[PDB]
Amino acid sequence: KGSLDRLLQQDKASLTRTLQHRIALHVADGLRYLHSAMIIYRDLKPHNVLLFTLYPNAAIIAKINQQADVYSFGLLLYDILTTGGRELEIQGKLPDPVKEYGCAPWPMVEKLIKQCLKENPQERPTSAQVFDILNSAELVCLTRRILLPKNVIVECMVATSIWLGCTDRGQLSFLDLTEGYTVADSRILCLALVHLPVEKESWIVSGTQSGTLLVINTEDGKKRHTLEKMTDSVTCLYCLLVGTADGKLAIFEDKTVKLKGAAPLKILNIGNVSTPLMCLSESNVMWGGCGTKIFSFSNDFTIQKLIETRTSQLFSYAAFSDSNIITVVVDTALYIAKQNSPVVEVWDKKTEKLCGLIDCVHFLREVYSGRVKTLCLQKNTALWIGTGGGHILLLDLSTRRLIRVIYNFCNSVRVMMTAQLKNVMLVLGYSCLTVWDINLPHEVQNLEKHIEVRKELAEKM
Amino acid sequence: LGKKLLEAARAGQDDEVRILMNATDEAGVTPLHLAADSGHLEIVEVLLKTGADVNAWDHYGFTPLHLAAHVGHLEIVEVLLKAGADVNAQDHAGWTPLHLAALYGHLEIVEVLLKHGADVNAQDMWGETPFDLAIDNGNEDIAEVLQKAA
């Protein structure tokens, strides 16, 4: 049903990203076969692809010097990613795809083009290697990948344009997704957003080690105000809640933020200085942990349940269990991550007792530190787990089984959470920021199934 | 058997001891490893004499000096370098016992290991020395003695 000229000419809308990475995968699965049985092409062009029937979830979508063919395939992949482009052919000086042609960003292909377009016919990747790199979910989705300058390390970030919280003087950096990134004595440990749709203004509030909460708006950084929480290092904000280092938590009314130095509606105390409250999650019942113990809110802002998670030390290491909570995510079961702990436990919100364990290093050693850093929960059933090293873990809450150990192209990972930019991830680590589509694990499963089906068909033929 | 011993060492066998006549686990926890977390003292005086390995690292990679600087102890370290535990063993994240000591503000431990021949130029893939770990957590007191011994 057509040839790969018309859709590149007129049918630009139907060329979705998952379909874009279905032709090149299928072309390189024929080029690999050709070079396997010692053949050459010398005319690999979009004119010789001749798709069968274009729609993503299809078994077959399109099908057709030795190293001079890989250059032509790289040119074809360039003309696939850039839906257009019609002495410069063999020049090695073509413009970057998104730089001039204005295509949607897509790393690990924008780099594959450069890798396969080198002006030296001896080290460009062979077709087997090019197909091997081409088939990968980390390549297919990876919506964006922004890089940050040296010694701009960060440990807190929030969506909306993305606010980045970064020396010994607290400075915050406004990042826009453009892509040109840009105020307290103490460094900003944690940061979160609140929204007031009634007054069509959004106040962005950051926590500092000196405890001087800041009130600024996203449209301009001029109208600035402060609150009067203080008394410790604010470790978590949520929408307004505050979690300090002494276990105290300060609830805030939505409309109190505009007033200068507004008092909390009611100061709630959990524990002592050795127990910091650093995690707050939305289920209308709040959840969170302090030191080593979990609690629960109600509609009148009072603790209802208070379970002790020190009793988890009967399993795993006491050196990990006897630690502060970093983050909590509340599904039907409770997931909390301990400080410098490669073990994530599963807590039952009903029986108030442990019901399972998740060993991050047990998944990691099948593919580098393993110590959990952040937890992310996605929609119905998909769990995202960080790691102290450079790693990303995907889990399936149905069976707690690994989907794919995504390797972040950085030494470590610090903070990640869901976002709505089209729904995307936001993974940040040492410093690089990577943006992934929410459908990453289902995409991994679908691509693996489709590749298995296609391999079976090719073995049949 | 081995599972019962390694689980009870976490709680503390005291009396039960071990087979008057060094099994691992699927998680790789050895009796000394599980024992040095709870920080008992009978553990390393009734099991080291038996012949339990001074260094039998875990899947995480954890000699029972990393654990002793993790939980925070004095007697366990004082005893375990009597046998001659490797003061320069490295975690799978490249943490030495001195690194973990400086991470948790134990001046006593860094003082103990430094006099026993602990280095200060130990390295990880993050390129951080125990001085960096000490300052990053705000425990400049340990960094002072590390600089003095540097």
Residue numbers in the entry:
A (entry chain A): 1952 to 2015, 2051 to 2072, 2085 to 2158, 2166 to 2171, 2174 to 2184, 2186 to 2190, 2194 to 2250, 2263 to 2306, ...
B (entry chain C): 16 to 36, 43 to 171
What do the authors of the reporting publication say about this deposited model?
Leucine rich repeat kinase 2 (LRRK2) is a large multidomain protein containing two catalytic domains, a kinase and a GTPase, as well as protein interactions domains, including a WD40 domain. LRRK2 is a large multidomain protein. Its N-terminal half contains armadillo, ankyrin, and leucine-rich repeats, while its C-terminal catalytic half contains GTPase (Ras of complex, or ROC), C-terminal of ROC (COR-A and COR-B), kinase, and WD40 domains. LRRK2 forms dimers at two interfaces: between its WD40 domains and between its COR-B domains; these interfaces are important for LRRK2 to form filaments on microtubules, which is enhanced by high expression levels of LRRK2, in the presence of LRRK2 type-I kinase inhibitors, and with overexpression of most PD variants of LRRK2 (3, 6, 7, 8). Here, we report the identification and characterization of the first high-affinity LRRK2-binding designed ankyrin-repeat protein (DARPin), named E11.
To do this, we prepared samples for analysis by cryo-EM by mixing LRRK2RCKW, GDP/Mg2+, a cofactor of LRRK2’s Ras-like GTPase domain (ROC) and DARPin E11. The resulting cryo-EM map and model showed that DARPin E11 bound to the LRRK2 WD40 domain. The binding interface between DARPin E11 and LRRK2RCKW is located on one of the faces of the WD40 domain, adjacent to its central cavity and opposite the kinase active site. Two insertions connecting neighboring blades of the WD40 ß-propeller (which contains seven blades) are particularly prominent in the binding interface: the helix-loop-helix motif connecting blades 4 and 5 (residues 2339–2351) and the partially disordered insertion connecting blades 5 and 6 (residues 2388–2414). The area of the binding interface, calculated using the proteins, interfaces, structures and assemblies (PISA) server, is 877 Å2, a value that is similar to what has been reported for other DARPin complexes. (i) The backbone carbonyls from LRRK2RCKW residues Gln2342, Leu2343, and Ser2345 form an interaction network with residue Arg25 from DARPin E11. (ii) Several DARPin E11 residues, including Val50, His54, Asp58, Asp79, Tyr81, and Leu88, form a deep pocket that accommodates the side chain of the LRRK2RCKW residue Tyr2346. Furthermore, Tyr81 and Tyr2346 show π-π stacking, highlighting the importance of residue Tyr2346 in DARPin E11 binding. The overlay with our LRRK2RCKW:E11 complex showed that the presence of DARPin E11 was incompatible with the formation of the WD40:WD40 dimer. Unexpectedly, we found that binding of DARPin E11 to LRRK2’s WD40 domain decreased preferred orientations on cryo-EM grids, allowing us to solve a cryo-EM structure with improved resolution.
